Each structure stands twice: as structure tokens, then as C-alpha cells.
Design a protein around this nucleic acid. Sequence first.
DNA 1: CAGTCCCTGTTCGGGCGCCG
DNA 2: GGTCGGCGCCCGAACAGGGACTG
Lengths: 555, 411
Amino acid sequence: VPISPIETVPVKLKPGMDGPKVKQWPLTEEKIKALVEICTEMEKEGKISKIGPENPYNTPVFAIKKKDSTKWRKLVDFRELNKRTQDFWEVQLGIPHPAGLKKKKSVTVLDVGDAYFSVPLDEDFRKYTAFTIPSINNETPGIRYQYNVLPQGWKGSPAIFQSSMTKILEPFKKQNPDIVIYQYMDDLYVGSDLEIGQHRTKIEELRQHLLRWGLTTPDKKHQKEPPFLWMGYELHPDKWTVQPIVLPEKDSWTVNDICKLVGKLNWASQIYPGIKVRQLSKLLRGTKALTEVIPLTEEAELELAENREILKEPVHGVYYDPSKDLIAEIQKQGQGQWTYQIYQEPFKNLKTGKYARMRGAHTNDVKQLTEAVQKITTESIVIWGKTPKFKLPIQKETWETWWTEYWQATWIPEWEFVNTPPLVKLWYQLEKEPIVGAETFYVDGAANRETKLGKAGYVTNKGRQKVVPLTNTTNQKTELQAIYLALQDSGLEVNIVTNSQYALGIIQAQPDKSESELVNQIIEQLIKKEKVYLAWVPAHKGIGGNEQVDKLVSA
Amino acid sequence: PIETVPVKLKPGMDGPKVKQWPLTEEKIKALVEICTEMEKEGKISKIGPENPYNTPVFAIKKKDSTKWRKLVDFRELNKRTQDFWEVQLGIPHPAGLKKKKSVTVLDVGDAYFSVPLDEDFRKYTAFTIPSINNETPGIRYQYNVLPQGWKGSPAIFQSSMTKILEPFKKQNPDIVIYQYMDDLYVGSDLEIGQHRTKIEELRQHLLRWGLWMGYELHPDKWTVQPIVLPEKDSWTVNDIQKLVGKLNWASQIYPGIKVRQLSKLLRGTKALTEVIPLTEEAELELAENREILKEPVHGVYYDPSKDLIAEIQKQGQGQWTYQIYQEPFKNLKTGKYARMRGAHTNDVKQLTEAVQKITTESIVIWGKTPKFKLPIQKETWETWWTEYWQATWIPEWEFVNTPPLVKLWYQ
DNA sequence: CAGTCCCTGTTCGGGCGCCG
DNA sequence: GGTCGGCGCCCGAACAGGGACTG
């Protein structure tokens, strides 16, 4: 067996575990011919070699059809080998995005044919890649081979090829510094500001540089004319767009059909602005079976019709110009949904996106807006290595009041206010000092763990009083219910004295939406008020009427 | 031609496997220039995916520093080698360093590149350099010498360090020198003028052995933030309610605090803005509780076997309070920071500045870095904290969400 | 007193999308 | 078909840690 020009990667097994010993699956006679034809050709090319009985290892093997071709692909079920093979640190940290590409004069894209089969395997590790190929007769013993290159299905094959490919491209990129090479697996995006003449010279130099290591660049996958098909996009000299996305038009929708629908809607939301999957994701909650048929809700049917109408019009994104600033603008779409556009010139979006993750049981729009700015920033540093300037639908005074008064550390980068309704604002403000001439409500409530029964009410300085019995409630729910009573039965200005850290910890965060309906009713009552002052006092200390009422709301 | 000191992990503990977080353009360009230069000097070398270990890497600029500085987040690796730099090659902490009139810090991290690393341990110093928009896969390296920011580097270099400092410690026996991580803390009671002169003498004394900035401190002027009660002449129901709640919370630290006579004033369902005269028995309970807050807590002392914990509170208006403790309510030190960089505009910069100041004081006083309870959401901190870091070490931290109780640590 | 439970937040396992 | 790695989203179940009440 000849020596490959590429240096091999030393691979070990995990300490104290032996190679795989699994029996072969029964294969159809149509896949048997496809494997014997490929195995006899790979053996002639030195990619697999025969092995005798001295190799006690074996692993299953099969084959699937190639897309839009009569050729077959050989795959190995290395599930038992992957478990006992050493762990690898993947070098693929992410996926490149076309919005991060810069305008280059000339662009070329090529693919290496059979990338894994052009990189050698470790000599001491070839023994564990033993498989059997069944014949057309079940009584024939079969031919046993072992891999001399990177097999497909092994958990170390992509990590090894990505690092070995980079080492081959390092000397070329060291001699040609101004040439940009986007290396993703075997797909190569080569671009340069050189003239179209010297560009194809450097391309042929690269196709010969890769040829010296056993990497073939077929002219079939060679691309010299726009539009280029790269990473599932369509690269034009001035714009880009995703390859056509097809949504299923099922008359009856299962759970797996919605998962494929949501998956393509999220993939489409990177350039198509305004995609919403709120009501469609509400169909996936609390469901158990993938094949379970589920009808579409009226809010889900309206959401799907809007997404289909957005996909009808053509959209396109531009490329990144490092000479101009980066701008990101957010909009409050639905209750819990947000959309944004990153651009450098107005209406020429680099890319779009959405953020709608619900964090916590209680929140407000300012919290969700801050979460969106952080998601956009990290996404921007991945693609462009810098933070964009933000156009936020929130008043400068609104944000100033929020972060200065919040007890947590919070901050937004350099941003400016855009007047795009709906505006993000604070719906109520708790006073810092007690209100003079306002009725003072001493609330608090309690419950019983066994009976699930409790009371809730208040006593005021003007003699006002109320106690309400409650069924199927908790100590926390009663303390909230007590404050809700004080808000309901008071004027526009009211002082409320509680002893519930739980109730106070929720209200001071200034939420405008909650998963609990009682909290939303407390929110709705707080918005109606003009001045509200909450105050916490320790319980069981005989404090004011808060002890007199704690005796009324004992049982 | 130097012999390598054999280093092993703690028993039953694999190496660090921490992913690399995204980096800005100015940080990536600085890391590529430094790593290519370090690889040219044989300090590091490229590796492949057969090394399953990885440690995050980013770059910083110290206070008033133009040059970028490579920083590795060896916090996970340091946790997995803890028995080495504490049991075998520990560094004694001088209890007099915190008593000096002036203490200067010097970055001696460049000296660790002179000692080779054990061949079997180099597998764990692996790190990956990311690329913008994932243009190229991860460019991985591993260390061939003693890495900066690893707690095993000053332990191995300690024997070589003492022999270099011996001529200077002999000429200056009253000067205290402590070494923590890539930093050298030099303290002396000399006048500020002759102090910086002795620092320059040590700079040239270290340049002749193959080693430059300085950061001054003044531990004798470090003040603590006690718990203080207001001095009101006219008290309302709302005032006494806040006073009782504050005293009820402070009773967890000072067990002698009583609120019996005070909470008796709040017994009627009175209006919060109503003025209440203090009874004779309540005026005595308040004055006595003020005297207990002046006394030190009973039974508080530093335990070298326990980890330090630091809590920080955002008091607004550029005010930040903190407490250091090993056991709850047994605070070893309290304090408050005010008017730091980013005040009245950037909370994250102030919090980053506060953590650096607190960790620095923890090194001078005890020689340990505390674990911080940060009052910030995890996603907010992990997005911006690298933009304001100006220190060669990184403390451990967790994120808390405690709404304000009775504003205990600030009036 | 240590034991629960009421509550909230986080982490992870698993489905899809997309790329090779 | 039921191979591998990477990134993204959405969900629920399991984990986990603090506060108030109870033998």
C-alpha cells in the first residue's frame, strides 16, 4: 500500500476498550451489487485492503442513494466504534453567513470529489475499521476489507478532514495573503480583488497545489459564472438570497409536519422579514406523538397565511462593507415576539431575524428588548466581529429610568431612539416615598397546606377592612390576592404594607405580562393607579395592623 | 536544556473541555499576531483535533495600556490541578503585605516562557482561535512553556524566582514581595518618591535575568462599610417600619439586636406618613442597637481551608457595596465603591471594575480570589464582561437575583 | 430544630431546519 | 435511508436551590 502525501492524524481508542465486533445486517440484493462494485474499485485505488482471519473486528455496512445521480454512497454504521473511540475537539465552530462576505472582484467556487476518501487514516487505527460485504448468496463467506482513508459515518472523520484541509491550504494562503478562501469542509469559496486574468491563474495554481496532496477539483463542480451556489445560497455580484424554500401544503397536519414547517420558517427568517411562528409553535406544546394529527388553530391559520404571502415576494440581502457603520433596528411584533434588521444603508438589509424566547414567569417589554439586543450583538460579533449601532423603539428617558432604578446590572450598547410604534415603555412606577394623604392598606394572607384553604384581606388607617375566603390556594397566592384586594378597593393613590417577600419581589420588577392570571390582574390594577407605594415589614413582629390582620387571615 | 517538573491532574478528573466564545475583530487580529510570534519563538505549536481538550482565549488591555495582552481562561484547568499548587509547591502569603503604605503590582508573566512544560501535561493547555464569520476552522495551539494565567506556572517558577529576588531582598529586608499568578506585589512603608525608585531598581534587577508596567495600591487606606442607622429627630410610621426591617435583618449578624420595644410603636393600623414619638423604652433600644453595630462580630476569623465568597449590591447613583465572607453573616470585610469608570452610564463596566478591585484586595489580604455572587443576568454578563476586563486573572462567579430587601448596606 | 412544598430558574434530551 | 460533525429553533422533563411553614 502506497503512502499518502497528506500527513495522517494519530487516533487512539479510549483506555481499556477493544474494537467493535458486530454482525452484518441482511442487505437487499440491489445494495449488494452497489457495494461490491464500489469495494472492488476502492481496493484497486488503495482505499481499502483485504483482511484475513487475524482481524477479529467487524462492523455493519450499508448504502443509500445519492441525490440526483445513479451513483451510490457507502456508509458504515460505526455506532459501536464511535462509543469506544477517543473524543475529538471539533474545529468547526460555526456556519459562515453570506452577510459577512465582502465585495470581491472575482469569485470562484469548487468542490473536492470524495473528500473523505482523499485523506488517509492512521496506520495503527486501520485495524478497527473492519467490515464485511455480503455476496449475492447467503452461503458465500464474503469479502472483508479495512479502511485506508477516512470512512463516512465515523465521529472523527469530519474533524480530521477539516484540520488536515486547513494545513494544506496554509502554504497557499501564506503566499497569497490578499486571496480570501472560505473553507467549510470540502467547499471552497475563493475570491480576490485581483483582475479577472490573474484570478484564474491563482485558481489553477490552487487546483494544482491541492492536486499534489491527492485532492481532485473536478470541472463539473467548478463554478466560474454567477450566480454561485454556496452554502445553500445564491451569490450574485451585488446581492444574495437563499435557495428556494418549499413549504408543505398539507390538508391534514401532523406534529412532524409542523416541525418541518417551523424549521423552514426559522431558516427563512434570516432574510425574509416578519416571519412569525408563535401560534404555530403553540401546536407543539404538550404533544406526545410525532405522527399525531393536529388541527390548525384560527390564529395558526392566519399566521401561516401571512408567512406564505411574505415568501411570495422576492427578497435579497447585500454584502458587508467595512467602511460604513453597522446598524440594527428592532420592532415589537407580537406579545413576546421581536424582529430586527441589520443593515448599513437604509432598506438594504444584510440580514434579518427574530427573537421570541420567553424567559421567566414574569417579565416586561424592556427585559425582552434587552435580551434581543444581546442576541443580536453576539450574532453580529460572529458574522462581522463588531457590535452594530441599535435603533430601539424605546424612549431615551424610558430606558434611563429603567436601568438606573433596577437592582440588577443592565446595559445597552450605543443606541438611538426610533419612533416606530408600538413603543416600549414602563406601564407603572412605584413611588420611592410613602404618599401623604393616601389610605394605608395593611394586607397579607395565609393558607393551610392540607386543606388548601386560606384567607386574604386588609385593614386600613381609615378603618376600612375586608377578608375573603379562598379555596385551593397556596400561601404565595394568598399574599398576592391580598395586594390585589388593596388595589381594587383603594383610590388612585394608595400605600400598601405587606410582609410577603415573594409578592414584593414580583411587583418591584415592573412586569407587564405574566403566566399567572392573578399577576396580570394586579398589573392591570397598577396601571389604573396614579401613585402606588409598596413597603415590606417583617412578619410575626406585631407590626401595626399587619399583626391585627395576620390574626384575621390566620386560618 | 532545562529539566521539566512533572505535573499531573487531580485523581479521577479529566482535562478542561470549554468551548471558545466569539471574539471581536480587534481581538482576533491581536491574537493572530501574538500566536504567530509565539509560535516563531517556540513558545507554542499547532495541534489537531486528536487533542480533545480546549480552553477559551481572548485579549485584553491593562489600565492605560496600548499593547494587547493574550489571556487564557484557565479557570477550569486550575480547578483540575488544585492539589499541585497548594500541597506540593505552595506559596506562603505574607500577612504584612496588607499593612504597607504602598503596594505595586508588576506583570512578570513574560518570565514563565523561559521554562519548558512537562511533555505529558502540554495536552491540557490546548486552545482554539476563532475566525470572523467562520471563514476558516479553528486554528488550535498548545503550550510548550509555562503558560500565563495557569496556577501551576508560579509554583514551578517559584524556586527560580526566589533565587532572583534573594539579592534584592537582602539589600531591602523590610520590603515584602508576594507573587500571585502573573503578578508580583511589592509593598513598602517608604515615602511615595523613594518607593517608585525601589520599584525601578527591581525592574532593572529583573531585566538582567531575562524578563514592565506598574499598578500602585494603598492598603493602609482601605476602609470598611459598616451598617449605619439614620439619625432622624422626627420619625414616621414608614421610618420606623424601615428601621425595624433593617434591624430585623441585621440581627442575623449581630445576635444582640432587639426590636421588641421598637415594633411596639407599630401596633396600630396607622398611616405611613403619620409622625410617631419614640417611647422611652424605644429610645434605649435604638441607642443600644447603635452601639452593637459599632462592636465587631464575635467569632469572625479567616480560615485558610475555606473559599472566599463576595456579594455585590447595586445601590444606584454609581454606588456599589460588597461583603467578603467564608461563612454566612461572618463577613471578613465590607466596603463600598463609588464613581468608578462608567458611572451613571454603564452598569457592566462598573461591575467589572468592582470585581477587579475586590479580587485585588482579596489577593493582598489573604492571597485568594473569591467566588462572586454577581447581581446581573447571566446573558448580560457573558456578553460584555470581556470588553472591560483589565486584569491577568479571572475569578469564579455565579449569578444571583435578589430583589432589594431593606437596603441593608447603604443608607 | 430538619422536613416538606410552593415557586422559579436552569440545564439537557430530542425533534426539525440548514451545511458538508 | 434510519452514518458523522457543526450551528440554529422549540418543547418538556429532570435537576436545584431558596423561602415560609411544621414535627
